[PDB]
Amino acid sequence: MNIFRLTGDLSHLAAIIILLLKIWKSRSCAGISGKSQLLFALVFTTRYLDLFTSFISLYNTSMKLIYIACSYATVYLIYMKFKATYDGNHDTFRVEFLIVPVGGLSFLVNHDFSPLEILWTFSIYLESVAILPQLFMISKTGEAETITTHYLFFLGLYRALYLVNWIWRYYFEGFFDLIAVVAGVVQTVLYCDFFYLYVTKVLKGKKLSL
Amino acid sequence: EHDEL
Ligand SMILES: CCCCCCCC/C=C/CCCCCCCC(=O)OC[C@H](O)CO
Ligand SMILES: CCCCCCCC/C=C\CCCCCCCC(=O)OC[C@H](O)CO
Ligand SMILES: CCCCCCCC/C=C\CCCCCCCC(=O)OC[C@H](O)CO
Ligand SMILES: CCCCCCCC/C=C\CCCCCCCC(=O)OC[C@H](O)CO
Ligand SMILES: CCCCCCCC/C=C\CCCCCCCC(=O)OC[C@H](O)CO
Ligand SMILES: CCCCCCCC/C=C\CCCCCCCC(=O)OC[C@H](O)CO
């Protein structure tokens, strides 16, 4: 473990808690893409199947269980408990254009042709584009609430910290995974317009307009 | 092994 990955994991947990607590306390999921929450829960489900085959650490196990529970709970609050405030009419991204090709790519381009590795690869490719329905919803509706932008900031910063972590691991440990890296740069570049707008507008008391 | 999240 290095500080870049630790801050990255804590930034990811921060985003997940900000969203869950925002929906819970306000009793509303207005402005939130239910489709992106489905994709993030599907990322954790396919990535962490190794909970049954590998033990890295108590931290690694606990973080995995917390991410699965918080992702599934967010989906439960949007689609079941506070479904009266779910804006289905503005969450119109067709997720089939993400799942079917990323599924195809994970089967063809992977480190090993075995079910656990193919499923892990699917989680990596899917995560790179999982936020697309949420950004697409914000551009359609025109605005994003401040708490929603804080959620997007900490979520976007998490995989950016992972890129720094991979430079660190490559230099100090000689470890390199091109699939995680390439997907991680794709994941971060999809936040470029949001980052620019968050720093120049949101951090200056202005409207985030995608 | 995959030791990250
Ligand atoms: C924009 C950069 C983003 C962050 C980049 C993260 C990596 C930072 C690397 C620093 C190199 C200098 C640090 C000292 C490591 C070299 C130590 C050395 O010379 O060790 C010799 C040998 O390995 C033992 O005998
Ligand atoms: C070895 C590397 C191979 C790299 C090459 C493969 C990479 C595929 C990745 C993503 C596909 C994303 C698909 C995005 C589809 C968007 C659909 C869209 O914009 O519009 C549909 C609309 O309904 C029309 O009317
Ligand atoms: C909306 C985004 C538009 C831009 C999307 C850009 C496409 C990059 C996407 C995914 C990474 C593709 C796979 C990365 C390459 C891994 C290839 C490799 O070295 O795989 C090792 C293995 O040995 C092979 O069998
Ligand atoms: C080995 C691979 C090394 C890769 C080295 C890093 C490459 C980063 C490249 C460009 C940064 C600028 C990206 C500009 C595109 C931004 C698009 C954007 O932010 O928003 C559009 C929106 O997502 C539509 O839905
Ligand atoms: C061997 C590989 C080494 C690769 C090491 C790469 C290190 C790059 C670090 C951070 C990117 C920050 C880029 C600058 C963007 C600042 C944040 C932003 O969005 O700034 C917009 C602002 O309005 C501007 O005026
Ligand atoms: C140990 C050396 C390496 C350290 C590597 C990690 C360092 C960077 C970590 C986190 C960035 C924190 C940025 C904090 C931005 C918070 C903005 C915010 O929440 O602003 C709320 C405000 O009210 C607006 O509405």
**DSSP track, A131-191:** THHHHHHHHHHS---HHHHHHHHHHHHHHHHHHHHHHHHHHHH----HHHHHHHHHHHHTT
Comparing C-alpha atoms, which of A71, A79, A63, A62 is closest to residue A17? A71
Question: A58-76 vs A34-47: helix axis angle to the nearest 10?
Answer: 150
* Resolution limit, Å: 2.2
Comparing C-alpha atoms, which of A28, A16, A38 is closest to residue A133? A38
User: How far does A140 lie from chain B, in Å, by closest CA?
Assistant: 31
B-proximal residues of A, 50-79, CB under 8 Å: 50, 54, 56, 60, 63-64, 67
Burial classification of residue A105, based on how many CB atoms lie within 10 Å of its CB (0-12 exposed, 13-18 middle, 19 or more buried): middle
Ligand nearest to C-alpha A205: 6
User: How far does A56 lie from chain B, in Å, by closest CA?
Assistant: 6
How far is A150 from A21, CA to CA, in rounded Å? 13
Domain boundaries, chain A: 3-86+93-204
Quickly tell me which residue has 């995608």 as its tokens: A210
The gap from C-alpha A76 to its chain's centroid, in whole angstroms, comes to 17
Comparing C-alpha atoms, which of A129, A136, A145 is closest to residue A26? A145
Ligand 1 centroid to Cα of residue A168, in Å, is 8
